[PDB]
Amino acid sequence: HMSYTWTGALITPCAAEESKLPINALSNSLLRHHNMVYATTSRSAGLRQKKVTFDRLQVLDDHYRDVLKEMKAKASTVKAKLLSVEEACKLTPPHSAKSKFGYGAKDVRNLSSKAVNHIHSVWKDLLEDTVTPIDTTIMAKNEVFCVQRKPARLIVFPDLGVRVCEKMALYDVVSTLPQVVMGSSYGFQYSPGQRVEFLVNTWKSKKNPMGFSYDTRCFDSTVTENDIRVEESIYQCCDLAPEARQAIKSLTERLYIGGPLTNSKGQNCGYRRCRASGVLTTSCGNTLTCYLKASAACRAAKLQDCTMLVNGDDLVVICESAGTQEDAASLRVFTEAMTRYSAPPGDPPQPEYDLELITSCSSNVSVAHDASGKRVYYLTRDPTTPLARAAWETARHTPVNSWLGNIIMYAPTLWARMILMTHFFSILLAQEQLEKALDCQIYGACYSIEPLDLPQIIERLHGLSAFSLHSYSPGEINRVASCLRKLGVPPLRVWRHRARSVRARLLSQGGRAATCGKYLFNWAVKTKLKLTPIPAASRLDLSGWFVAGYSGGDIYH
Numbered sequence: 316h317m318s319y320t321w322t323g324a325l326i327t328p329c330a331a332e333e334s335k336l337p338i339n340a341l342s343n344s345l346l347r348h349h350n351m352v353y354a355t356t357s358r359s360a361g362l363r364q365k366k367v368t369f370d371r372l373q374v375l376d377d378h379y380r381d382v383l384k385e386m387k388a389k390a391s392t393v394k395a396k397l398l399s400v401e402e403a404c405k406l407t408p409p410h411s412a413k414s415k416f417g418y419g420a421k422d423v424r425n426l427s428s429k430a431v432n433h434i435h436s437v438w439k440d441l442l443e444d445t446v447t448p449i450d451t452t453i454m455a456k457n458e459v460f461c462v463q464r465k466p467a468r469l470i471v472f473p474d475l476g477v478r479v480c481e482k483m484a485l486y487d488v489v490s491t492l493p494q495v496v497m498g499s500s501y502g503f504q505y506s507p508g509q510r511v512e513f514l515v516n517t518w519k520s521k522k523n524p525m526g527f528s529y530d531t532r533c534f535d536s537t538v539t540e541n542d543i544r545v546e547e548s549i550y551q552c553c554d555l556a557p558e559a560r561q562a563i564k565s566l567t568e569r570l571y572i573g574g575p576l577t578n579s580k581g582q583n584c585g586y587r588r589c590r591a592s593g594v595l596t597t598s599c600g601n602t603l604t605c606y607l608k609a610s611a612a613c614r615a616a617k618l619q620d621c622t623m624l625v626n627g628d629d630l631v632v633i634c635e636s637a638g639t640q641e642d643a644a645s646l647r648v649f650t651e652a653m654t655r656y657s658a659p660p661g662d663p664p665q666p667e668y669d670l671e672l673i674t675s676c677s678s679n680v681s682v683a684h685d686a687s688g689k690r691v692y693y694l695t696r697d698p699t700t701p702l703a704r705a706a707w708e709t710a711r712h713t714p715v716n717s718w719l720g721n722i723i724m725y726a727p728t729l730w731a732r733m734i735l736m737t738h739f740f741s742i743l744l745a746q747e748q749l750e751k752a753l754d755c756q757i758y759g760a761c762y763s764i765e766p767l768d769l770p771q772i773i774e775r776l777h778g779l780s781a782f783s784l785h786s787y788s789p790g791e792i793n794r795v796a797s798c799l800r801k802l803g804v805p806p807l808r809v810w811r812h813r814a815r816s817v818r819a820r821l822l823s824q825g826g827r828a829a830t831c832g833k834y835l836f837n838w839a840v841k842t843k844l845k846l847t848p849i850p851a852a853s854r855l856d857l858s859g860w861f862v863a864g865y866s867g868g869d870i871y872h
């Protein structure tokens with residue numbers, strides 16, 4: 316039961332790829348060790364093929380079947396609706412991959428006759444045909460990292476026509492079902508603030524808390540045909556229209572279970588018998604499968620008071636400790652159970668007794684103080700990848716601006732406030748592009764956001780404290796400092812000086828710009844200003860925000 320079989324044909328790009336960090340007049344002000352920053356290309360995809368290709372062995376016990384029956388019972392209370400062509404089309408990103416059948420992402424959004432006619436043809440084909448495998452494109456991702464070198468991640472996706480039909484049949488399912496089935500354990504329902512609140516409250520509800528994260532070695536490749544069929548049986552519990560049921564069964568047999576892999580040149584690269592990274596159900600299916608395997612493994616390990624938190628392939632468990640030795644022994648049983656269910660780990664899980672030492676979604680909980688010196692818990696991460704990606708975005712215009720998403724999600728952090736906000740507001744002031752909307756990703760979904768709306772947005776998912784945080788933990792400070800030394804980023808003292816300039820330039824401009832200088836850069840000045848609740852914060856249509864994960868699912872909000 317091999318995840319992949321290969322013909323020998325290479326994974327080809329759609330354009331000339333850059334691996335070296337592009338340099339411009341703004342590069343040195345952010346980063347000096349340019350050699351450290353790189354981007355993955357299709358020319359390293361052969362290295363990934365080896366890693367993702369392996370045999371999957373699966374042993375399913377009563378604990379697995381018990382949890383599944385409980386999951387199907389909760390799923391049977393979900394009612395999901397069938398979306399119209401126009402509704403699914405409006406959810407398609409503008410930078411989305413064009414169809415092989417004469418149309419693109421912009422044609423889809425504009426509802427061109429050629430696109431809509433093909434979408435209807437694929438839909439009719441899904442209702443009539445449930446055996447023929449759907450063709451997918453295997454492409455290599457261009458992701459930017461810092462060295463110590465990752466090979467390119469793989470992206471497997473069906474044609475744009477199929478992707479719109481996937482939305483019609485499963486967009487409501489993947490948006491409603493996860494929270495009903497997993498309850499508070501479903502991580503994508505939370506804003507960064509609601510997440511820390513949930514982790515801190517959960518950690519505090521235990522007599523002697525123990526927490527750990529579980530890292531599955533190549534989760535998509537570990538997903539078996541059984542897992543994909545089990546996902547469909549859960550989707551089929553919902554109150555669905557007979558067209559949606561037929562399209563779900565069809566997309567499962569023909570696409571989700573597996574199919575041929577085709578490169579950008581139209582050559583057969585091989586066959587996939589695992590999870591596709593570029594389908595609508597990637598996030599949802601990964602969450603269901605992980606939660607199911609982990610819940611049953613909690614039961615097998617006899618873990619006391621298991622509180623789970625699942626986001627795709629990412630898993631955090633907070634439970635009652637039984638001492639260091641009994642915890643280490645319980646984590647072995649948990650891993651033995653996960654391995655049996657075809658979910659072995661990358662690095663073995665380790666018991667942690669300090670919430671701040673637990674890393675899940677590349678993030679950890681940390682503590683700072685607000686204006687009244689009161690302790691305040693927030694989400695942070697190592698700023699290496701956010702800084703390296705920002706350095707690339709300083710020289711090249713990318714379809715998705717990682718720095719904007721990073722300011723949104725990590726707004727209370729030291730590194731995002733002092734470096735990310737400073738640098739990019741400076742760039743925006745210079746080009747007078749403060750009023751221009753930029754595309755960014757939040758839980759895998761694409762959002763067109765106006766940078767002048769940043770103070771209202773941050774207040775809504777972090778609170779007003781985000782603008783007043785100080786007296787940061789020594790662990791977080793040394794982490795940021797270490798990252799700056801590594802990449803050659805100017806010290807935090809230089810960033811304060813620069814922020815005083817950016818702030819004054821923003822305030823001079825008045826209006827929304829003055830609000831950005833006021834709220835975002837209050838930390839930069841000794842004589843602080845009055846940070847009052849913003850009237851525009853309530854007037855934010857945050858509908859769709861923190862409902863579900865859509866990573867690789869081709870979603871625009």
Ligand SMILES: CC(C)(C)c1cccc(-c2ccc[nH]c2=O)c1
Binds near residue numbers: 675
């Ligand atoms: C920090 C937190 C809430 C754990 C998280 C989880 C998943 C994704 C993100 C994220 C970070 C940066 C940009 N966009 C995102 O969605 C952030």
Ligand SMILES: [Zn+2]
Binds near residue numbers: 378381
């Ligand atoms: Zn039982």
